[PDB]
Design a protein around this ligand. Sequence first.
Ligand SMILES: [Cl-]
Ligand SMILES: [Cl-]
Ligand SMILES: [Cl-]
Ligand SMILES: [Cl-]
Ligand SMILES: [Cl-]
Ligand SMILES: [Cl-]
Length: 276
Amino acid sequence: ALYEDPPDQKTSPSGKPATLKICSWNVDGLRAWIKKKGLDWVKEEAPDILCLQQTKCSENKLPAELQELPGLSHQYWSAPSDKEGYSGVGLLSRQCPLKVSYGIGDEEHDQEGRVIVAEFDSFVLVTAYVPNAGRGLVRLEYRQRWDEAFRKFLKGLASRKPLVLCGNLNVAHEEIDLRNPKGNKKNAGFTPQERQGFGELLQAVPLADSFRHLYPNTPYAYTFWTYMMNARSKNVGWRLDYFLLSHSLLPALCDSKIRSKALGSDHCPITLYLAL
DNA sequence: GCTGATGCGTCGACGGATCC
DNA sequence: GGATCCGTCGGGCGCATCAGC
Ligand SMILES: [Cl-]
Ligand SMILES: [Cl-]
Ligand SMILES: [Cl-]
Ligand SMILES: [Cl-]
Ligand SMILES: [Cl-]
Ligand SMILES: [Cl-]
């Protein structure tokens, strides 16, 4: 039940070469991840745009190593005001975005540090660290309300420029998206409510799941494994990290990768190749 | 300033019952 | 009586705060 991500496809269905490489990585403690050489892997991957989630780091505490990325020199960071040490997201880009914003409507009052929006010439990029439903589903109702607020927010944005949404969306959409579907239907990340919310997200905005679009029947493809019980060595995992795309961008889609071998978090990186 | 405790956030292994 | 279903329970990791020094 191990998994080998197939080779990188770097040309679109119409034969156009990839021009844009976006990497998304839920790093689960940015400072720890850097100590575990996460930036060395990033340099090898050489993305045009790097989106990070669960940084657990306010901007004043960013390691200096992050100042020595000449190919990712435009950097935007967010962290929650009243929950330091949790959430936190970042977006780093080769080229300067046209516009950058934070949160999903009222960040200035509910500084949550979970979402960054960056508008580029031909698309809008959103990265998100979606709220976990919590152990015992204690925060599932909050998650459901957040899912609705986020859908409404994104519908707004995609009504003008094509959208790319990436990050830790904290749900395995369908049974194929985790190793143990039967045992986890009452656990955060695989409740009927969260799965429904993801389906409504695809239909309402609308968006497509880039990986599943390309690999509709491929099992055992995950992006998260608990640190407990050696799960990663057994590939007992969940696909929690996505690139979701406006349908108008599917002709630009070259590939959507899962970088299973890259260590330094309990999530692995995912990478998108677009021909723009 | 430093270490290590505690707090907080964040499911697969296992044993036993049930299915035919 | 092997496969499957089901409920219980021990438990890695990062970071903030705190105690001790
Ligand atoms: Cl967190
Ligand atoms: Cl938010
Ligand atoms: Cl999907
Ligand atoms: Cl363990
Ligand atoms: Cl994915
Ligand atoms: Cl792939």
